[PDB]
Design a protein around this ligand. Sequence first.
Ligand SMILES: CCCCCCCC/C=C\CCCCCCCC(=O)O
Length: 433
Amino acid sequence: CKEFSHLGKEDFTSLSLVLYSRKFPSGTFEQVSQLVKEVVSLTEACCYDTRTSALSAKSCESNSPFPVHPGTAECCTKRKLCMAALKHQPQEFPTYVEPTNDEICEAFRKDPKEYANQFMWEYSTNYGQAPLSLLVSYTKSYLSMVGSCCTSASPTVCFLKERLQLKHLSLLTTLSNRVCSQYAAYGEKKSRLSNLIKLAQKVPTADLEDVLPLAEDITNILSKCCESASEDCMAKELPEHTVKLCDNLSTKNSKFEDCCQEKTAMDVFVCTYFMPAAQLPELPDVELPTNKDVCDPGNTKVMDKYTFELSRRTHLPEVFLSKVLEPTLKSLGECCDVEDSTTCFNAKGPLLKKELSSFIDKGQELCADYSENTFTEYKKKLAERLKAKLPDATPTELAKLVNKRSDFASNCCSINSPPLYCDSEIDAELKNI
Ligand SMILES: CCCCCCCC/C=C\CCCCCCCC(=O)O
């Protein structure tokens, strides 16, 4: 109620559209607009579960106006406020594409309101994991640009200049959506390890000491800035993070040196982000940390050292590594709070080693040749491998397997593969062939 008054009607409604578009990434323009239509109608005539209930209720109605969370129609079976318990899944495959200047201005003069609403909805559903404060700030600035540029002396020049002034906020928002989505999908502890893994893969040359502080720092920034309703801090924190990146890795790797030479902190960050897993020196094998030092609740130095060492020695994608480390380390951890840890470790050790080895072997089998070749060249070697394992396979059957397996590998064998999507795709591929 307090916000509705201080913000007004139209503005409070704008905030809501962005707010609810983030919540229902899969929702349609119509549905989200409809839900917001009545959420305001509520606040207004209540500034009260008389309307709050009418909302949750009219939400289950088969073929309902409102957008639906996965599990809504399910747990609706009725309390009945299970809906608030349901967590929303991010959109990992953004499809937002900015129209041409003409497309923008024609749409804008014809219907200024719906053009801005369609934009706030589509931009927010696509990059809904970026901080609310940032989305609101970018979409308001963007609409202001559209507003002034389409009626300027020369829209073309206006747009060229104004988009340049907005590039920073623009890249910051999509970048923030990407890293915060990964953060929300994994949770703080796994995100931290995930980032430690990726840095290890990008610079196996470095020592644990060069990358750990960085995994720590990015993690601190995300837990602090990924969620803010009015004052964004991603812009305040990320630049100094690139300074740490360069201080520690600028001289440890040629490619990092080049990244660190770019014009802005944003460019340095993006550049390091897109950097793929480099060729690994292939050092000696590393045994699981089956020792009392992993029991330190105060530190994770041991778990971090193992994670780091495993990453710079095992040619496997981070989505795979992060996936198996969690259960593995948790299993080890079960030998901590017992009367005799040594006996527990000596028993669990041989078992975890085989399970890990099996997972790793299968994962490297699923991603074989992807990283070292161009997609096309990958597709070619992949077929040869399949041909050798399936001599009686018709060319059609081989084509289908090549298609399926190359689809999986393009989605889940890259350093920046989608966590949520791959988690389930990996489960399936593991019990394959
Ligand atoms: C989702 C990643 C799974 C990776 C498997 C590596 C081992 C993890 C350790 C313990 C969890 C158990 C899962 C394996 C099934 C066998 C059951 C058993 O532990 O006896």
